[PDB]
Symmetry: D3
């Protein structure tokens, strides 16, 4: 339940190599892994795995399995499957990890966090849930409603924020996004508020280019942290989405929403490696505590079942 | 908390009439109500109230207040406010009510329900929640995944449906929507399943007009019930959305999502009167039981505080 | 200078018939006019003349010229050219004429005028100029800024209106258009203002269909007069534009802008006949008094030079 | 090779009924055909067969098979397969047939033919090929280039037409389509030309609605025959395309292009029944003689293999 | 009347600092200006002032006011208001000024001027008005109609140009823009004409990218001067518009239209600083002489009232 | 028949220079060629010739004709016309030529060829025709159907490929393009197939940028050869189309389709010079052998007649 397509293709690679070892102590032949890896590349490409992740996986798996001897009679599966597990693990932990709580505590207040992402990414609810998480840890929070052309989205943010006791700074419909965020930062300075979260637009407006707007807000607010948020069910999209954003304003961390429904998993496996930024939180449900700090070992076990 | 703009404008009308009675047993003069009602019309139009609802409100309020005597010394507010309450109540209960459970029990199985609405309406999660509600009442359910160009939306539906034990009938990406629904109906016939719910597209596709597609599915599946679903936060939209749908395929019932965040309320007040269909359920939160059967008196008290 | 293409094609028809009379008292033969009229139809169609106007012209010209004798030696040109002049004149004066000033004087105040047209039609400046014209005639005027998504257009209207002493009623960006117009009508009632002019949107908005919006405003404001405004330089467009509008809300009168630059003239010749509404004013320049009451004889002489 | 999906689903229905007869002189039971027909409906809907054709097929097949006795030992397949063949045949020959050559011979010249269809339908090459076919039969032809915003398409038409000795009437880029066609008709009158073919636009232009333009051309040219052309490979499209066109201007005949590559066949099977117009020619290749007069028996044998 | 929002926010900053000096010879404290400047930044951002202009203003105002002593009893307002005036003045006069008349006189003829800007900028009428201005100064002028897909715009240009005696070089609808401009330059060489003005497209065409087209015309015509034209009422737009253009072809000078109606003023204040090009002319009305050479002191007094 | 506009403008330049020599052994004066070349530049720009080709032509023609003496009485035309012929010839043969057959023979199999181009370019039929050409030369071929969102285009490719005995590798609708191509390369390795041809998308998809997709496929498949295909009738387009593609992935060779209908010829003359890649094949008809290897001398004679 989760990552089925990715898991099934990884298992099919283990079984192919195991066949070669059966027909065949014996040694695992490079020619045999090369062939099976060619089939795996086809499968992973169709499962939304980025090429550079496919290439890194080939490199790691080859280096781990070529030269290896299967003591005749033992359990092949686990030797081969152990190389694959290690390869996958290594591509997850490439990005330098970030301890949000320690970064905030040690920083001069307010710690300001800018969110980027396209509409449908789950950005607005993520911000409310993160505000709640921060408060449960003893931090005060204020939210800047800089998504100024979506009255509906702001109403929804306002309703979630009232419930958990965090203030939303907003101006009138169509206001300048950067002015709203700068306003929230001043308000936070005056009240000794620990963290400012910036809710941004997720689509261009008439003569207001999305990437240009993100650069302006970044220049105006000088964020401590830029977080990309992406919808895991949009497999064929999130990685290219994060590439565009990263190109306008460097991404520090990633949050993936609706991960519990992600039956594929190639994009989720790839994004951290490609963007070179750690996954900080995963959304795994519709309740507030359904935003969990990312746990590598939990992720790995969901991939391998 | 909810319907603030609507409530504030209704209260401002009560206060204006009360002023007239104070400056002024005295009698409440038609000229005085007419004037205050002109100001109310301006206010309700800016709060997304449909004109025909504004007109019905004027007619009812006028008929209830003109000729009425305020015993000098008593409480004016409650006499005037009582007319307004009755007027609003009468526009809510214009549509003939539908008892879903009794309609299903008495019908030949399967009872088939077609949903219509644009993307963003909350249609997909509503269907899962309604399936859950039906099961809690002893009905078996199957879902037809006829929204065949949204792989992400279907994954999400599949995940919710597995959790509550209802089967999803789906075909491959881009399949014919009507064929999927007809497939689910046959499957339901074979297994003695009580209810079939049809999850439809919410946007046009290249050479596949949304309204034309809805007519085809209706003709193919002959639904017992057609339910429009609409997002309450899209005040300026839901009523015109339902008008278009009603025009292609007659709407029997309405479900409004995200009502807990609706700080305005004019559209929600209007939609049943305009479409001449009862509101069956309201979405008031992110949990499954956050889809509640519509309760008129609860609604009225949320409007008047 | 003006209407050159139309004039040149009409003259070319006169010359062709005159040739036939020369080669040939003699009589003007129906076969000869029929042939020359076939060539004229080709020419007028390429000059934006609507088919039903082409057909009416053929019918009138044929009836006027067939059977007619040219006294051999006289001036042919003027006999033939006189039929054409009469035909053109008759298609201009098909619509029942409207005396705006007498309609206003005799009406119960305020007299309300709704304008319709697509952006680029010159609608906004036309309204200011008409307000000025009305004031020069002793009428008080107020303008409703119901084009609520164009901040730039409203600024421009505000600036023109301040200069001539007329008040503009406006709400905030994105407000409900009908509420603004109803507001201006109440304001006019309170101040004894003679005329209300309604400045409307000229393009659809996200989930706000232009024709649907025009019907709502009409229902809310119950205008005495609906005026279509169109840009004469958009030859291939204005007639179809007016057809669409007429279909949603009946057009009473037409104003054509930028007529002084119209080197073609087929559309301007056609529009009144097709819509069955008189041209009330023509825009012939950039100054305020460059909006002139339509004068049939002036128009005819501009066509024939 | 051709119509594989349609054929495979029809065969699968025959085999299901045959199973029922085997497990089971015996008689073919209505309950058995009903069930198998429910599965066929699912299959035909997914193969682009229109519902009303699915319904007519059910009606005919049921009437032909219910009550029928299979003499025990004989060949079931052919009895059942014979009913299906007859049903399919009857839906092909519903429209009254048109003998183009006899219609032209008996008509007053020029016989004018207007073509309608969206770009990509193969309309432009079809017109050239039909012109060639007409000439091989002794008719003179002229082509009106009324697709006036596609310089590339007209160049291609001009090149094909020069090769077969037919004249193309064209004006300058962006000219009025109706004026071009009326021009070609006059030219044809003057030269005693038998047939005029009108090449029309296949997409809307800025302020020039496609259906409105088609009505204008029809009114101006008064065609003897209106031919819809459609691309068979656009299965999910051609029927709705023809519906729209038929709605603006009644369709007399249909030509389907690229039929040799049509591996599906549901739309091609349906279109004549739905539009109530005969298929006149099929395009089965890239050479000029690859436009063949439609032959019902050839079509049937391609469907059944 | 003009620049009200900008003026009101600048005045509100003066009053805040003056309060601090009152509550408080005294000295003006940096902490006090810093605070008030933070509020000013919020206000100027919402008034369309570009960030780099906000930053330059902060830098200049701080440097001018910090350390300054208010002789107790004197007029504070004027000391503070004088710093602000100087700051604003310095951001206006950052770009090196251009004397158009002297540049033309001293140049080898023809002096060629290319205009860039999006449709709605007022580009076409600006060119006619500038041609008139040049002629009033003794220069001969020719206009290249390189906006070849807007027949309406060219008609309007032709009409204005005939009135003032300047020739328009134009080709047929849809012609190559660069060929038209090169044609006008040759024509000017042959007739000893002093100045060529190039009227360009203001929107992309099917497969004709606007910026790519501007580079081609620049390469073909080698202009002496490139002028950006922008509509002042499009506050949220002109600066980004000029950035894009500047990026494809370097801008030498700016003309702002409809400045008399500009009730905001932040964009108009910013554009010269951001683009590093002087404002050459302002449009302040609908008559020909309503295009005025830019006058810094007039501008400043309109800002401060 | 072909290249008429280009030829006519080149001839008009020869005649102008010849006039100068007549009015005038005499010598051909640089001033005379300069003038006539200015007129030629206007003409070639309007015929879709790229500026850098216009510039190279001027440079070559000037160098060849200036200083040249016409022996008085001889044939001027041929001396001048000979310079022009040489100039045109030199711009055609600027790109280093490619012998496809020798490149394939000498390469390690499979030789992989990636095609790029926008829809409507004739890419899909070109690939089938090239496959046929390769087979007639003794090479085995496989086609990768990487244009995965066009079911119709793939059906057509499948039908052409079956006829000539080449296999098409395809996956399901909407599959990952790069995975399909990598699949075809593995299949080719296993069967000893000489050449792999990659059929790519020609338009962007929702969140799948065309140029980004082309880079991915190139990275995944490491093609030996990248071929741009372009439609000659799209004069105003192909050169900019090839520029964009070249920018994402370097173009090695060009194929121009529908050249037999190209009545203009400026773009076809320019493209090789601008892209710095040879034309490998021209499409001159609808049959398979209507894809001809490019022949410079044949091309030149078609240009000059």
């Amino acid at each position: 339940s989760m990552f089925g397509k990715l898991r099934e293709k990884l298992k099919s690679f283990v079984k192919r190599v195991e066949e070669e070892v059966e027909k065949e102590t014996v040694e695992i032949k490079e020619k045999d892994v090369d062939k099976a890896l060619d089939e795996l590349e086809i499968d992973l490409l169709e499962a939304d795995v980025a090429l550079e992740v496919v290439d890194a996986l080939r490199e790691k798996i080859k280096q781990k399995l070529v030269g290896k001897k299967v003591r005749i009679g033992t359990d092949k599966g686990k030797i081969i499957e152990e190389a694959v597990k290690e390869a996958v693990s290594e591509i997850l932990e490439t990005s330098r990890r970030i301890d949000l709580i320690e970064e905030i505590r040690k920083a001069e207040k307010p710690y300001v966090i800018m969110f980027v992402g396209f509409n449908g990414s789950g950005k607005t609810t993520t911000i409310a849930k993160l505000a709640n998480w921060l408060k449960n840890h003893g931090f005060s929070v204020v939210i800047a409603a800089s998504d100024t052309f979506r009255a509906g989205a702001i109403e929804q943010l306002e309703e979630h924020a009232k419930r958990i006791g965090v203030k939303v700074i907003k101006h009138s419909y169509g206001a300048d996004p950067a002015a709203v965020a700068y306003d929230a930062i001043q308000h936070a300075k005056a009240r000794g508020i620990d963290v400012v979260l910036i809710d941004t637009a997720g689509r261009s407006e008439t003569n207001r280019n999305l990437m240009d707007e993100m650069k302006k807000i970044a220049r105006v607010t000088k964020p401590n942290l830029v977080i990309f948020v992406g919808d895991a069910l949009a497999g064929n999209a999130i990685v290219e989405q994060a590439r565009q954003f990263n190109e306008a304003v460097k991404i520090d961390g990633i949050i993936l929403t609706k991960l519990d429904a992600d039956a594929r998993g190639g994009a989720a496996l790839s994004i951290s490696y490609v963007i070179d930024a750690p996954i900080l939180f995963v959304g795994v449900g519709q309740g507030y505590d359904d935003l969990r700090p990312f746990e590598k070992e939990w992720f790995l076990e969901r991939i391998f079942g």
